Amino acid sequence: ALLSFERKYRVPGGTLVGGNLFDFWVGPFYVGFFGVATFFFAALGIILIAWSAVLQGTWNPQLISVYPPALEYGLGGAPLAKGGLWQIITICATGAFVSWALREVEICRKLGIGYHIPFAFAFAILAYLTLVLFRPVMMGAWGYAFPYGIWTHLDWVSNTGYTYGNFHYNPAHMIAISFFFTNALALALHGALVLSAANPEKGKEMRTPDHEDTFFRDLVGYSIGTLGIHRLGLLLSLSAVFFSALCMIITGTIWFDQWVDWWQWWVKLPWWANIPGGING
Amino acid sequence: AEYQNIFSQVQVRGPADLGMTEDVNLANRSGVGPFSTLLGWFGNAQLGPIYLGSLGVLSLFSGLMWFFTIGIWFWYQAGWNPAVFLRDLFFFSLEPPAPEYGLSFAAPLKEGGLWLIASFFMFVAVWSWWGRTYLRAQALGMGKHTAWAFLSAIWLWMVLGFIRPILMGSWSEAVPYGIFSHLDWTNNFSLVHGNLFYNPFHGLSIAFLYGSALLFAMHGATILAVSRFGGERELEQIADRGTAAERAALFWRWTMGFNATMEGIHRWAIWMAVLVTLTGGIGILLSGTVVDNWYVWGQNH
Amino acid sequence: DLASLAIYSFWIFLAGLIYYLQTENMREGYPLENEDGTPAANQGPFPLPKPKTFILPHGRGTLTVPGPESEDRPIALARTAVSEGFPHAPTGDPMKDGVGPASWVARRDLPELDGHGHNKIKPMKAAAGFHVSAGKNPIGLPVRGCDLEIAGKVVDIWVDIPEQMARFLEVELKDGSTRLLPMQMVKVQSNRVHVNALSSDLFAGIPTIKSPTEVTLLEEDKICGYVAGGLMYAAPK
Numbered sequence: 001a002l003l004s005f006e007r008k009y010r011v012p013g014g015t016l017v018g019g020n021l022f023d024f025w026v027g028p029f030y031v032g033f034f035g036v037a038t039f040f041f042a043a044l045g046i047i048l049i050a051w052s053a054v055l056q057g058t059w060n061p062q063l064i065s066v067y068p069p070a071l072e073y074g075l076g077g078a079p080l081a082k083g084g085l086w087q088i089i090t091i092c093a094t095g096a097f098v099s100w101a102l103r104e105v106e107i108c109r110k111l112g113i114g115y116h117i118p119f120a121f122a123f124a125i126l127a128y129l130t131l132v133l134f135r136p137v138m139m140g141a142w143g144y145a146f147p148y149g150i151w152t153h154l155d156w157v158s159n160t161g162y163t164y165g166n167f168h169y170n171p172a173h174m175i176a177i178s179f180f181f182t183n184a185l186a187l188a189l190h191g192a193l194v195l196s197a198a199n200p201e202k203g204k205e206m207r208t209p210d211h212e213d214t215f216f217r218d219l220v221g222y223s224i225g226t227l228g229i230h231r232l233g234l235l236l237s238l239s240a241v242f243f244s245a246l247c248m249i250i251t252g253t254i255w256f257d258q259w260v261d262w263w264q265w266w267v268k269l270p271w272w273a274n275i276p277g278g279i280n281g
Numbered sequence: 282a283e284y285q286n287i288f289s290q291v292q293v294r295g296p297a298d299l300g301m302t303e304d305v306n307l308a309n310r311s312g313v314g315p316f317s318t319l320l321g322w323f324g325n326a327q328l329g330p331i332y333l334g335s336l337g338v339l340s341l342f343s344g345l346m347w348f349f350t351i352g353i354w355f356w357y358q359a360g361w362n363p364a365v366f367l368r369d370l371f372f373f374s375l376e377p378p379a380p381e382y383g384l385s386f387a388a389p390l391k392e393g394g395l396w397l398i399a400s401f402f403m404f405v406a407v408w409s410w411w412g413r414t415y416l417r418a419q420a421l422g423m424g425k426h427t428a429w430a431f432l433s434a435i436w437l438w439m440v441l442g443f444i445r446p447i448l449m450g451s452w453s454e455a456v457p458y459g460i461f462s463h464l465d466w467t468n469n470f471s472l473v474h475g476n477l478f479y480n481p482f483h484g485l486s487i488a489f490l491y492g493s494a495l496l497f498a499m500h501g502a503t504i505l506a507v508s509r510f511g512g513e514r515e516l517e518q519i520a521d522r523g524t525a526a527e528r529a530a531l532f533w534r535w536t537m538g539f540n541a542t543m544e545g546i547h548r549w550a551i552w553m554a555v556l557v558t559l560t561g562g563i564g565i566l567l568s569g570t571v572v573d574n575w576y577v578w579g580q581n582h
Numbered sequence: 583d584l585a586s587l588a589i590y591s592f593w594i595f596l597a598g599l600i601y602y603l604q605t606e607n608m609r610e611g612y613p614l615e616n617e618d619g620t621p622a623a624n625q626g627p628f629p630l631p632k633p634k635t636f637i638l639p640h641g642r643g644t645l646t647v648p649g650p651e652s653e654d655r656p657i658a659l660a661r662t663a664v665s666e667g668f669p670h671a672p673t674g675d676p677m678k679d680g681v682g683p684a685s686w687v688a689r690r691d692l693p694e695l696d697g698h699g700h701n702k703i704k705p706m707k708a709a710a711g712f713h714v715s716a717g718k719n720p721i722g723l724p725v726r727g728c729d730l731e732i733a734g735k736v737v738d739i740w741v742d743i744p745e746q747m748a749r750f751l752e753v754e755l756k757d758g759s760t761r762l763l764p765m766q767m768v769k770v771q772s773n774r775v776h777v778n779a780l781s782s783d784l785f786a787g788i789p790t791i792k793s794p795t796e797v798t799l800l801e802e803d804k805i806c807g808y809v810a811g812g813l814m815y816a817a818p819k
């Protein structure tokens with residue numbers, strides 16, 4: 001079925017591959033070549049998870065966990081049961097995400113809007129590929145990647161983190177968190193502001209953008225504006241994920257020690273490093 | 282290539298907007314600040330004016346007293362040595378009283394009393410500011426959404442610094458005032474409580490923090506993608522649906538089977554972000570007071 | 583146990599919050615329709631939200647949503663298929679008819695107003711004090727389509743006054759009339775302004791503004807829609 005204003009937008013065109021062969025919708029969903037590709041990769045990855053589950057001897061989603069190959073496998077293929085299922089499921093995940101993105105692009109072209117959304121979803125994909133592909137390759141083994149299970153992947157984050165002491169001390173981890181925290185702060189404020197102008201005090205007319213500007217000027221001495229804030233939210237979220245990828249791609253590839261050691265570039269600097277007093281002297 | 286509307290091609294400067302009067306007392310509104318061509322590439326160029334009423338100055342003064350209290354203690358830990366100050370700035374820590382003193386304000390200055398004085402000033406400074414986000418909105422005839430979402434953040438803060446330590450019987454359970462020390466306190470907190478990954482409220486808080494980055498990336502991209510139909514002007518799209526709103530919704534309906542509206546997405550936004558600190562506060566509040574070990578607790582319930 | 587009670591309570595709250603949020607996001611576009619325009623049998627599991635009302639400023643009346651919903655304009659499209667889920671082909675010129683990526687909405691035929699009731703968007707020539715403060719000044723530069731021919735010259739910039747930003751470029755054509763091009767569909771360069779969306783001969787097709795010092799929300803949608811429609815429909819040149 002259709003939204004009341006949707007019909008006028010359901011025209012032929014926009015596809016990158018297949019011509020008009022896959023140029024149709026199932027219910028609300030656009031299909032396209034990349035919709036059948038997504039389905040093929042998602043169908044196959046889910047079947048392989050369920051195969052992994054029959055092998056593990058459980059149906060409980062809380063317990064199902066597809067581990068990657070042992071480290072001793074390096075970057076070779078492994079037998080289905082001992083990491084091969086993870087390797088294929090990862091290939092299927094990657095092809096699904098990339099296909100989902102290319103499908104978003106087809107949808108952008110049909111509606112004549114910018115490609116900002118798939119460009120943005122690509123950063124999430126690159127972060128995934130950092131943990132699952134780029135870092136493991138630079139480190140020498142697929143086993144360094146995270147296992148596909150609801151709780152076992154958390155344990156991976158715990159084990160990987162504590163290999164380098166407190167991971168808080170990773171300077172790129174600090175920047176990423178700063179961007180994450182600032183992102184949620186910004187989203188709360190933007191969502192509030194628009195809502196506060198659209199849904200004002202009882203017995204008041206709907207507010208204008210000038211009110212939105214004036215509120216943030218009164219409160220903080222600066223309004224970034226309607227365009228600026230949507231630019232900012234995009235910048236913050238993307239930056240957060242970029243510095244996430246960065247802080248992991250350097251961990252175990254060019255940095256191997258406890259991360260707290262990084263900060264001696266400042267403390268144990270020759271001139272003030274000897275001076276008596278403070279914490280580190 | 283195609284222009285992306287991330288940075289402006291041409292800036293435009295005009296008479297500064299002094300802003301909406303409404304019920305604002307203009308006596309407390311400052312003069313207009315100057316324009317920033319650097320900021321103008323990305324957002325607005327105008328700086329100010331700002332409102333600074335009886336409550337805003339109280340907040341500024343208590344916030345500064347907090348900074349000057351942390352600062353005077355950092356200098357004393359440095360032995361009044363400016364070179365040592367810069368080198369160990371991130372390692373200094375105003376720690377709370379030890380457990381022996383419990384919830385008493387009777388601790389000597391050098392062993393946690395100064396922490397209590399800092400905490401007083403920060404308590405006055407945050408609540409003064411929260412009253413301010415409320416009053417600014419009231420005077421402009423706006424909703425109180427900014428104040429109510431701000432209470433969510435204050436709640437997590439209130440739990441870490443005040444409500445949890447009080448139910449635990451000692452100020453020593455509170456968070457120390459230091460860059461690196463507050464991270465170490467955060468790590469010990471999880472170790473002590475049997476891995477905070479297994480605190481279901483911590484996992485919710487993560488879902489919402491990750492989900493805030495997801496949602497703002499989605500909405501920021503969406504609006505920039507329909508800014509060619511004036512989509513950033515969200516209030517006129519709410520009052521009078523334009524093709525910007527329509528295309529945006531259909532992008533997502535076609536992509537994931539369902540969509541928002543121009544107003545409605547900002548409800549998704551305010552809750553996604555608010556639930557970060559709301560769940561997080563609950564989860565911290567329950568650690569130690571009700572559940573000693575989250576991993577253990579998880580394997581039974 | 584109290585933590586169990588908390589977590590279980592929250593999942594109850596969250597399902598209630600999602601339900602509320604999804605109905606809040608049905609205040610436009612619903613109820614869903616079949617392809618022939620009639621109301622669809624299947625409407626999903628969430629109910630239509632009970633109406634709300636915004637009182638618009640400057641005597642502009644009130645919007646009730648959800649409520650009586652129509653396109654209130656002719657849609658030049660035809661069904662491609664007997665069953666549902668298939669495209670609808672333009673019966674005419676999709677650019678001039680307003681369909682597909684060239685689409686527009688029947689918005690109020692009045693200009694967006696700022697907070698003091700004046701026009702939000704005005705040409706810089708009628709905007710006391712406004713000048714180009716940074717980047718390349720496009721006024722006086724040739725405007726070039728994607729067939730590389732010159733459609734005209736930029737004669738002004740239309741600015742959003744409250745936000746202080748350039749929204750449209752007013753461009754003079756061969757015949758001497760002018761048209762507005764959205765600023766986020768142009769690339770301003772050191773010696774010309776390039777418009778990837780449109781070929782030169784198609785600039786005259788951009789719908790026109792009634793009054794020469796103001797633009798209505800209806801005209802902006804018609805304009806913006808037509809230009810972005812060029813990415814699909816002018817592309818074979």
Ligand code: BCL
Nearest residue numbers: 097124125127128157158160161167168176177244245248
């Ligand atoms: C003891 C553990 C360590 C620690 C160890 C690690 C490790 C190890 C890592 C992190 C990483 C991160 N840590 Mg840490 N971290 C610690 C403490 C903290 C603290 C804190 C409060 O103290 C904070 C705020 C953070 C914050 C963060 C983030 C900055 C970052 C994860 C975001 C990310 O990468 O997104 C990226 C987003 C994705 C990967 C999502 C991918 C999405 C894909 C493309 C789509 C999936 C589609 C799906 C299958 C479809 C579903 C279908 C239907 C819906 C049903 N950490 C402690 C000190 N942290 C990680 C990082 O930076 O990785 C890049 C990382 O590897």
Ligand code: BCL
Nearest residue numbers: 046049128131146150151157483484485487488491492495
């Ligand atoms: C980023 C650094 C670490 C990491 C650190 C953490 C930490 C720490 C936590 C999680 C938590 C979660 N992580 Mg994780 N997580 C990582 C990478 C992934 C990947 C991936 C393919 O890249 C996926 C799909 C997930 C998915 C998940 C969710 C199961 C869970 C809630 C997060 C959320 O809502 O985000 C925001 C996204 C949305 C709001 C969109 C909805 C996404 C839905 C809910 C995800 C469903 C996943 C589904 C079960 C996958 C199977 C698909 C089927 C086979 C078809 N993570 C990397 C390896 N993750 C939390 C948890 O509670 O774990 C149990 C948690 O505390």
Ligand code: BCL
Nearest residue numbers: 434435438467468470471477483486487490561562564565
């Ligand atoms: C080893 C350490 C533990 C850990 C221990 C903790 C602890 C302990 C906590 C968290 C908390 C959080 N953790 Mg953790 N956390 C870990 C690993 C992770 C990982 C991961 C591995 O990927 C992730 C994604 C996270 C993610 C998160 C967040 C969801 C959550 C913080 C939300 C927030 O917004 O705080 C930032 C926001 C605030 C603190 C609000 C404060 C706002 C105040 C009022 C503002 C004052 C400003 C001040 C006056 C000065 C500046 C003003 C200037 C003038 C500008 N954690 C590891 C496993 N984590 C917190 C939580 O809620 O958990 C349930 C928390 O307490």
Ligand SMILES: CC[C@H]1c2cc3[nH]c4c(c3C)C(=O)[C@H](C(=O)OC)c4c3nc(cc4[nH]c(cc(n2)[C@@H]1C)c(C(C)=O)c4C)[C@@H](C)[C@@H]3CCC(=O)OC/C=C(\C)CCC[C@H](C)CCC[C@H](C)CCCC(C)C
Nearest residue numbers: 045092093096100120121123124149150241491494495498
């Ligand atoms: C880069 C900034 C942030 C971001 C942005 C972002 N995410 C996005 C987008 C954008 C712009 C989309 O357009 C796209 C979307 O359509 O969302 C509605 C998306 C998306 N982000 C999603 C999830 C997601 N994003 C996340 C993060 C982020 N997304 C970043 C923080 C996260 C986490 C963990 O933080 C998750 C879980 C999806 C809702 C959606 C992409 C949906 C998709 O790709 O569909 C095709 C694939 C399937 C239907 C299933 C594939 C099945 C696989 C073959 C099997 C699963 C294998 C998997 C590796 C196992 C996981 C087990 C875990 C327990 C570890």
Ligand SMILES: CCNc1nc(NC(C)(C)C)nc(SC)n1
Nearest residue numbers: 189190212216223224225226229
């Ligand atoms: C109308 C847009 N105004 C506006 N201004 C600002 N200013 C800062 C710098 C605090 C983000 N924020 C918002 S929402 C964050 N909106």
Ligand SMILES: [Cl-]
Nearest residue numbers: 334336337413
């Ligand atoms: Cl005030």
Ligand SMILES: [Fe+2]
Nearest residue numbers: 190194500515
């Ligand atoms: Fe918005």
